[PDB]
Design a protein around this ligand. Structure first.
Ligand SMILES: Nc1nc2c(ncn2[C@@H]2O[C@H](COP(=O)(O)OP(=O)(O)O)[C@@H](O)[C@H]2O)c(=O)[nH]1
Length: 297
């Protein structure tokens, strides 16, 4: 008798009321209050509310749950547009649906942003996806980074290619790529020179690594908490090197959700993964659900 109730459900159209702009006034102001409370910036708040008006005005609803369902689907869609720019995001399918014999990934970013840690996370995830990997340590003058990757490479049971201190960073990356060909390794991950500040020497070296290593995907690593410094790092790597995608680290330290969402709005490249902790598994695909849960209670 549950199919008899579903047939009855076809004849329930009289309770369906069309939403008028005037109907939205109060709830739009309450959503605004909560967004701003949850550290959502003004521009993102305005975009999100405008997308809510546009997705609601046409519609017919008969109860609060139907309204909530349009609101939630609209929120998840706006958040998706903010973070990914509606670009493809799955690195595994990127690698798998690609022709490249070893798939070469290069990583950019300044010091203390979490770059060596999320390379270990990327290694961890590709292992969980049955993809073999090696790391090329091409930050050859920051001997600290050499230690960090050496620990991770050992814990993760993965080969680390490294040179002498101060070695040609393009050699480390080139050698790692031939090593990966010879051993039929699926993916190469190249660490690049982390500094306190981008500068002219770093740019020339990155471009030399790029033209000699020929990577298939370039990822910038940004601290989701660093605000305008993060936007300044992204703009300088954009103008002088170019990259394809962003990984935001420390998103777990953004309690209310809006800080990383407000940063992403001003980024021009998609955010493809998010670091959410210090452990290897603390790497999640972009998820609108993450931001909806944090922003709203
Ligand atoms: N809470 C949190 N901490 C992180 C995350 N990613 C990195 N960190 C921490 O940030 C600090 C610096 O990271 P590290 O990989 O050494 O940065 P690097 O110098 O750029 O290579 C470390 O203590 C990391 O544990 C994250 O997603 N969440």
């Amino acid at each position: 008798e549950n199919k008899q109730e579903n047939k009855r459900s076809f004849f329930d159209f009289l309770k369906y009321k069309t939403i008028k702009e005037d109907d939205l006034n109060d709830v739009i102001e309450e959503l605004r209050f909560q967004l701003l409370d949850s550290d959502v910036s003004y521009e993102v708040t305005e975009k999100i509310l405008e997308d809510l008006k546009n997705n609601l005005i046409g519609k017919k609803v008969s109860r609060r749950e139907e309204v909530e369902e349009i609101v939630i689907n609209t929120l998840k869609k706006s958040i998706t547009e903010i973070l990914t720019k509606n670009q493809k995001t799955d690195l595994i399918e990127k690698i798998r649906s690609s022709g490249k014999k070893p798939f070469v990934i290069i990583f950019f970013g300044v010091n203390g942003v979490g770059k060596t840690t999320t390379i270990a996370k990327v290694v961890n995830m590709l292992k969980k996806n049955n993809l073999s990997t090696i790391i090329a340590a091409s930050d050859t003058f920051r001997a600290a980074a050499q230690e960090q990757l050496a620990y991770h490479a050992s814990k993760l049971e993965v080969q680390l290619i490294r040179g002498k201190y101060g070695a040609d960073p393009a050699s480390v990356a080139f050698d790692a790529i031939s090593f990966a060909k010879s051993r039929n390794i699926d993916v190469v991950l190249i660490d690049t020179a982390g500094r306190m500040h981008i500068d002219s020497d770093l740019v020339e070296e990155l471009k030399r690594v790029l033209r000699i290593a020929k990577p298939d995907f370039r990822i910038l690593i940004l601290d989701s908490l660093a605000g305008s410094d993060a936007l300044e790092q992204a703009r300088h790597f954009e103008n002088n090197v170019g990259y394809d995608a962003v990984i935001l680290t420390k998103v777990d330290a953004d309690a209310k959700g809006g800080i990383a969402l407000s940063l992403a709005y001003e980024l021009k490249k998609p955010v493809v993964y998010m670091g959410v902790g210090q452990n290897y598994d603390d790497l999640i695909p972009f998820s609108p659900d993450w931001f909806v849960e944090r922003i709203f209670s």
